[PDB]
């Protein structure tokens, strides 16, 4: 991302692609390394009634 305008033009022309739109190196677009806690859902056997094991 720090490449000068001339170098961007040079390596774009050499490759034939717009390399600046799809850089191999990751910058700020990645997910934050700290996330809010999850709260995961429970399966279909998490019931208080009509749930005898012999039926499932």
């Amino acid at each position: 991302a720090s490449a000068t305008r001339f170098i961007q033009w040079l390596r774009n022309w050499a490759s034939g692609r717009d390399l600046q739109a799809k850089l191999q190196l990751r910058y700020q677009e990645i997910s934050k390394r700290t996330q809010p806690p999850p709260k995961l859902p429970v399966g279909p056997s998490h019931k208080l009634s009509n749930n005898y094991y012999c039926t499932r």
């Binding site: 019931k47 208080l48 009634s49 009509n50």
Partner: protein, 429 residues
């Protein structure tokens, strides 16, 4: 007949129910007790069992088995062991206090009932098991028994009939479970009142390991009058297969709570109004009725309008006649709390022997405590229903069923009240 009720005084059996006549032998004889007892005994066990059979009498202790057939299990030859009659005077079902009146006001009816019932079974003696709290009543019974012994009506050559018969009174020590017939026997044998599994049946292996029949106080005490007046006289009262007269206890939210003798199949509404003075605050103030002791499911006012008071009619209403203890709850009642207290009762009375009642009833009690406060989720109502079905039919004795049925009655008829209680709690918190 199609209408039942309005029993006439001449057709009542317990004619000293209220203790306004001499309860001792002289008074008892003037009222017809101990009359032609010798002729009854000499008629033979087969004749006595036939008269009780034709009477259509059914057990008055709560379960209602045909009495004549039940007592016929004993009518079998000797095999060396003594045979006994055990009279169940434990009288422990909440709401039920009928057997108390028989013992203290009509003891000689019970004593004669033991002898006649004892003869039909071939039993050498009768043990009357009476709850420990009934101290004064037991002392009355002992006095009557001594009068019978002195008059030669019981004991050696009882009533001059050549039949030897003793009557012993044994007191309990505080346990509802000892009303259960096998737990009663275990208690007499000096053990914890824990019911036995069946088989064997008491008619094969009973008290002291000998043939026994356990009969309710009311069942035994009406037998001498049935033999005197005939089985057909008894069967003329009540519906078919619901024969006879019955002692009813009307308690709770009625104007004049009382014990009364009435015909079987009398309408529940008629019984409450004619004898108990009606529901407190008027009939329309009625909420629910427990028709036959705390072990029978409640029924709402709508069911109570037309339901008859007998075994078959109440089974059709998804409940039971039980002991015929009518507990009335008006609309001021906290129905959820009232049932929760009965579950607390069964939790205190469970003998703890077998897993589903030892652990299940205590579990139901904890859930009901939260349901009283609304401190639960609606999904727990179906869970509580399912828990009660895992107790019912899986325990050693019927106390487990007796704790499951009241819960089922509440959920069946008052689920909206349970859900409303939960909504209120959640909004507040």
């Amino acid at each position: 007949k199609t209408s039942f009720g309005s029993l006439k005084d001449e057709d009542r059996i317990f004619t000293n129910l209220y203790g306004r006549h001499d309860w001792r032998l002289k008074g008892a004889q003037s009222r017809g007790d101990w009359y032609k007892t010798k002729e009854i005994l000499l008629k033979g066990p087969d004749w006595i069992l036939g008269e009780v059979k034709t009477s259509g009498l059914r057990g008055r202790g709560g379960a209602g088995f045909p009495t004549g057939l039940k007592w016929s299990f004993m009518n079998k030859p000797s095999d060396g062991r003594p045979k006994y009659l055990v009279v169940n005077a434990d009288e422990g079902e909440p709401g039920t206090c009928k057997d108390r009146e028989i013992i203290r006001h009509d003891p000689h009816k019970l004593v004669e009932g033991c002898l006649v019932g004892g003869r039909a079974m071939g039993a050498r003696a009768a043990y009357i098991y009476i709850r420990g709290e009934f101290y004064n009543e037991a002392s009355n019974l002992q006095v009557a028994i001594r009068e019978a012994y002195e008059a030669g009506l019981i004991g050696k050559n009882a009533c001059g009939s050549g039949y030897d018969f003793d009557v012993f009174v044994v007191r309990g020590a505080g346990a509802y479970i000892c009303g259960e017939e096998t737990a009663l026997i275990e208690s007499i044998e000096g053990k914890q009142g824990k019911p036995r599994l069946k088989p064997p049946f008491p008619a094969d292996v009973g008290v002291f390991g000998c043939p026994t029949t356990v009969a309710n106080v009311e069942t035994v005490a009406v037998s001498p009058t049935i033999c005197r007046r005939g089985g057909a006289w008894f069967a003329s009262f009540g519906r078919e297969r619901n024969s006879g007269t019955k002692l009813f206890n009307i308690s709770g939210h009625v104007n004049n709570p009382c014990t009364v003798e009435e015909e079987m199949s009398v309408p529940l509404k008629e019984l409450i109004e004619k004898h108990a003075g009606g529901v407190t605050g008027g009939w329309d103030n009625l909420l629910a009725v427990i028709p036959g002791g705390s072990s029978t499911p409640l029924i709402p006012k709508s069911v109570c309008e037309t339901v008859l008071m007998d075994f078959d009619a109440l089974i059709q209403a998804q409940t039971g006649l039980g002991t015929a203890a009518v507990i009335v709850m008006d609309r001021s009642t906290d129905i959820v709390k009232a049932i929760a207290r009965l579950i607390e009762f069964y939790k205190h009375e469970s003998c703890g022997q077998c897993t589903p009642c030892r652990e299940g009833v205590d579990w139901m009690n904890k859930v009901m405590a939260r349901f009283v406060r609304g401190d639960a989720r609606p999904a727990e109502i179906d869970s509580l229903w399912e828990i009660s079905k895992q107790i019912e039919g899986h325990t050693i004795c019927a106390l487990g069923d007796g704790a499951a049925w009241p819960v089922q009655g509440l959920i069946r008829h008052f689920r909206p009240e349970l859900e409303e209680r939960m909504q209120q709690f959640a909004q507040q918190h």
